Amino acid sequence: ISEITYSDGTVIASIDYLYFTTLAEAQERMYDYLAQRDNVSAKELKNEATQKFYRDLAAKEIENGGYKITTTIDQKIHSAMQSAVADYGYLLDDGTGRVEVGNVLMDNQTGAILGFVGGRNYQENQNNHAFDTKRSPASTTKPLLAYGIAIDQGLMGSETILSNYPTNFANGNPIMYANSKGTGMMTLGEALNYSWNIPAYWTYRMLRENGVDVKGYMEKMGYEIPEYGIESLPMGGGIEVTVAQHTNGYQTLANNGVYHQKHVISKIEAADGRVVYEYQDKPVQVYSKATATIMQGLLREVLSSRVTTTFKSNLTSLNPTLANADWIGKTGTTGQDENMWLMLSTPRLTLGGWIGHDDNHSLSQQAGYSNNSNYMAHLVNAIQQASPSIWGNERFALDPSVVKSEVLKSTGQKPGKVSVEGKEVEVTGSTVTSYWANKSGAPATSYRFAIGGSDADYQNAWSSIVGS
Amino acid sequence: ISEITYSDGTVIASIDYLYFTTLAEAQERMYDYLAQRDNVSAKELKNEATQKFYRDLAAKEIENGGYKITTTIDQKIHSAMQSAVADYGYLLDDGTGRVEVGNVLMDNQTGAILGFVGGRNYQENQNNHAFDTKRSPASTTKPLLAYGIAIDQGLMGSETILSNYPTNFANGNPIMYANSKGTGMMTLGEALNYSWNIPAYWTYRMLRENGVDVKGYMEKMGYEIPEYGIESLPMGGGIEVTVAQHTNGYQTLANNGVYHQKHVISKIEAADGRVVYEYQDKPVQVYSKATATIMQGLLREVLSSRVTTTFKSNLTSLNPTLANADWIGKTGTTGQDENMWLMLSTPRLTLGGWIGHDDNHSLSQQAGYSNNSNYMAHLVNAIQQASPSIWGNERFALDPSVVKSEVLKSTGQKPGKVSVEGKEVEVTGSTVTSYWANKSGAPATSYRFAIGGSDADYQNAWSSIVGS
Ligand SMILES: *[B-](O)(O)[C@@H](C)NC(=O)c1ccccc1Cc1ccccc1
Ligand SMILES: *[B-](O)(O)[C@@H](C)NC(=O)c1ccccc1Cc1ccccc1
Ligand SMILES: [Cl-]
Ligand SMILES: [Cl-]
Ligand SMILES: [Cl-]
Ligand SMILES: [Cl-]
Ligand SMILES: [Cl-]
Ligand SMILES: [Cl-]
Ligand SMILES: [Cl-]
Ligand SMILES: [Cl-]
Ligand SMILES: [Cl-]
Ligand SMILES: [Cl-]
Ligand SMILES: [Cl-]
Ligand SMILES: [Cl-]
Ligand SMILES: [Cl-]
Ligand SMILES: [Cl-]
Ligand SMILES: [Cl-]
Ligand SMILES: [Cl-]
Numbered sequence A, B: 001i002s003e004i005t006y007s008d009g010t011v012i013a014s015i016d017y018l019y020f021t022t023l024a025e026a027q028e029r030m031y032d033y034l035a036q037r038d039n040v041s042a043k044e045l046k047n048e049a050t051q052k053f054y055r056d057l058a059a060k061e062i063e064n065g066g067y068k069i070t071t072t073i074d075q076k077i078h079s080a081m082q083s084a085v086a087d088y089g090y091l092l093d094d095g096t097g098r099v100e101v102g103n104v105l106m107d108n109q110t111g112a113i114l115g116f117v118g119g120r121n122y123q124e125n126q127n128n129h130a131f132d133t134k135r136s137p138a139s140t141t142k143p144l145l146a147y148g149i150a151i152d153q154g155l156m157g158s159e160t161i162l163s164n165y166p167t168n169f170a171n172g173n174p175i176m177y178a179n180s181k182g183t184g185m186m187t188l189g190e191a192l193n194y195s196w197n198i199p200a201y202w203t204y205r206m207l208r209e210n211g212v213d214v215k216g217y218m219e220k221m222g223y224e225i226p227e228y229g230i231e232s233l234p235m236g237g238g239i240e241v242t243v244a245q246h247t248n249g250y251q252t253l254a255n256n257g258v259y260h261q262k263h264v265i266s267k268i269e270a271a272d273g274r275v276v277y278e279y280q281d282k283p284v285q286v287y288s289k290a291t292a293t294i295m296q297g298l299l300r301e302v303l304s305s306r307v308t309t310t311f312k313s314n315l316t317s318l319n320p321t322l323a324n325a326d327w328i329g330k331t332g333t334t335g336q337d338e339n340m341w342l343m344l345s346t347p348r349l350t351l352g353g354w355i356g357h358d359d360n361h362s363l364s365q366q367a368g369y370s371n372n373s374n375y376m377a378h379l380v381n382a383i384q385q386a387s388p389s390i391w392g393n394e395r396f397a398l399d400p401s402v403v404k405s406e407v408l409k410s411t412g413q414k415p416g417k418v419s420v421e422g423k424e425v426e427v428t429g430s431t432v433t434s435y436w437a438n439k440s441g442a443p444a445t446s447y448r449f450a451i452g453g454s455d456a457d458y459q460n461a462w463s464s465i466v467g468s
């Protein structure tokens, strides 16, 4: 009798989302193992008939064998997450029909998956929203693919200024944020807290212009994106992900820039104890520790600001002590409200969350801001009541390698002479600490001080500043 | 006394659009000449003050000198084009306010510019729409940047099938053609004649997927495009051009794939006869002769089909004998009707044409289809009445190197066994000659026979075909 087990070895089942997800993954491990065992090359595995046979053999091998498949799943925590979706699932329903949901709770030090929600109720709808459904991750792409990489590359600090003035995509359409064609200059923090789009667009433009290897970063974390030239990439255009994959992206940021590959299987043993597969840790430093910890600091304010999510309010009411753990995170909303995301970390754990409809019809405007935030607050609470120390009380903290520059609030760059329409001008004014992940820190102030912006934009902004 | 002259040496003027365009270009030649004459490096020319001085010196040098600046402009033809815009300009006005216009008539063998229209009336509006205004070239980008390059690369023949089924951009928006989300499979000819967008989008996707050096082509013709990853690049997203530059793109196609750099100055001589600048021909084979001549054949049908332009009807009425020259061309329309283009070639000459408003407000829906077509028909007529043999009576003809494959109408690929949902199936049916620019011609028919298309798309199309 083969058995799928929780991480402590309690038996899940002899050989619902949990069963079928872990069994499908075990079948894939068994496939690789049998193929190598029989000396079938990946040249021969190119053959559909050979491949099919080996898939069948893998499945029957588990059925008939006496294998012990040890998963990473924590019984108590995964059972708490099931009861939480059962009990509080209905908080998602927002007047647009029944809302579907996926969640993945991941250990930031190992990438092990401790439990997950695959959906509202397997018995009514079997689609697995944690591992199978691929969806645009919307604005939760920004910290990873735009600002994170900019910061990593010495192209941006914590208090850098970005343009949020009006501007068009290549196709001539305006870049929108709900009904706003935009505003003016803003700090990176404000851009993150509001999730404005134009500042993200300019950041990614800057990366392209500099020929930064964005793919090198994203592929290290296991993302597959077919076109890196897409302008709205940081807003979720041209990227689709499962919740488990995307959680692994936030795991990397939470773990001080060090990726660990997600997994639900830690080991498969034959009846006699032969280890036929075992997870092998392959840690990767995807962002510098300076970058990661700078980003942790920005993402803490995302949640504490409560601009795009009610989550910290919902949590503080449910569980004030837990709300005082060091929560960081980012929300996402797709352009027609088709996908809402909330990704959450403490230094120990990352919990990813998606809601949406299976046929891609729209959620209500506030599904992500309010409903998912409340559901995920109840989820988080449930996890903690199951395993009181699991989230931890550690804080995220800036790595010793972070560089601190004193920069003008108004420019995000150092006080200096700047040439402004003819005149060289002493740019002076009140300053602020800005965090950087390069060697030298922030540049001296320049005329084009901000990330992006047209000539008109700068004339408007300099006029403004020049009122000293 | 310095003098700007027509190509025969008749004096234009001692030292309006014509005057200022040729004088500005002469100033730039004089700038390079004086800088080299004084041994100022391009390192020193990096200095703004040195640069400014040298620009001033160039201008004063012409003023005070005795230089003879010989332009490529044909007096009679350029004077006919002025009278044509004066007399028939008003045909552009379409109920959206006064419409602006730019035209450039180019010799396909030399790239010499024989005359141009800079606008409706210099005296009312000085903007130079032939040489200065940069605008999206819309769907006239397709032959150059999508199908041309696909054909060049052995990825497409004259009767290849493309998908025009419904599909979304990376941002999740549908690809539109006016109010159509699209249709089904279609030939390359139909795609060109209608200017459908989805088939163009898939072609460019295919290029990106294959890592084709699209930039290598476009830069050879002197285009500057900042982001080659833009999905709507073939529809004019992310590209802006002057009329003179874009004419040079159609010159390359008309001249059997061989680029000649556009120019309005052929020579500058000092009073004593010293040749201080002279145009130097640097011909480049940008597309194979097979490709170019295949494309000539497709673009002839664009005009003869009269789907997107009334031009051949307007011309046949004005001048039936001239309408029977071998006209090929492409129209362009931007998404809000802001820019309309019509590019025209005979084997001898290429005439480019743009209309639009200076502040970018919309034209009427039919400004490009009807009004510009009629204006340009009158322009063409005027040019011919000035210089009766200038357009020539030669035909475009397929180069001996073009490969001819007999392919199924339905697939654009060769008759063959194809695996269709289980069954291998004998795909048979009526065939057609398809032109190719590779060594081997069209592949055998495959399941995914068309450029682009989803799994659903192919199921719909194969079902259809399978009705033998
Ligand atoms: B992102 O925050 O997911 C970003 C790309 N989202 C939007 O632009 C969006 C989609 C749908 C409705 C509104 C918005 C803007 C918005 C407004 C308030 C908070 C977050 C996003
Ligand atoms: B192309 O033909 O310039 C292409 C990208 N144009 C359009 O999609 C367009 C823009 C504005 C209005 C309509 C259309 C579609 C269209 C309809 C008939 C003929 C040509 C273009
Ligand atoms: Cl499942
Ligand atoms: Cl489950
Ligand atoms: Cl066996
Ligand atoms: Cl356990
Ligand atoms: Cl996954
Ligand atoms: Cl858009
Ligand atoms: Cl990249
Ligand atoms: Cl992915
Ligand atoms: Cl790329
Ligand atoms: Cl696994
Ligand atoms: Cl996994
Ligand atoms: Cl055994
Ligand atoms: Cl580091
Ligand atoms: Cl808070
Ligand atoms: Cl709140
Ligand atoms: Cl649904």
Ligand SMILES: [Cl-]
Pocket: A318, A377, A378, A379, A381, A382
């Ligand atoms: Cl609760």
Ligand SMILES: [Cl-]
Pocket: A402, A403, A404, A405
């Ligand atoms: Cl420091």
Ligand SMILES: [Cl-]
Pocket: A404, A405, A406, A407, A441
């Ligand atoms: Cl400092």
Ligand SMILES: [Cl-]
Pocket: A154, A438, A439, A440, A441
């Ligand atoms: Cl540095």
Ligand SMILES: [Cl-]
Pocket: A202, A206, A450, A451, A452
């Ligand atoms: Cl920038």
Ligand SMILES: [Cl-]
Pocket: A454, A455, A456, A457
């Ligand atoms: Cl500007």
Ligand SMILES: [Cl-]
Pocket: B016, B017, B018, B020, B021, B118, B128
């Ligand atoms: Cl001019």
Ligand SMILES: [Cl-]
Pocket: B016, B017, B018, B019, B082
């Ligand atoms: Cl003129």
Ligand SMILES: [Cl-]
Pocket: none
């Ligand atoms: Cl001199």
Ligand SMILES: [Cl-]
Pocket: B006, B007, B008, B009, B010, B073, B074, B075, B076
């Ligand atoms: Cl002349």
Ligand SMILES: [Cl-]
Pocket: B130, B131, B132, B242, B244, B245
């Ligand atoms: Cl030009």
Ligand SMILES: [Cl-]
Pocket: A171, B169, B171, B173
């Ligand atoms: Cl769009």
Ligand SMILES: [Cl-]
Pocket: B212, B213, B214, B215, B216, B228
């Ligand atoms: Cl390219």
Ligand SMILES: [Cl-]
Pocket: B222, B223, B224, B225, B240, B241, B242, B245
């Ligand atoms: Cl250009």
Ligand SMILES: [Cl-]
Pocket: A229, B227, B228, B229
């Ligand atoms: Cl590129």
Ligand SMILES: [Cl-]
Pocket: B025, B262, B263, B264, B265
């Ligand atoms: Cl020139």
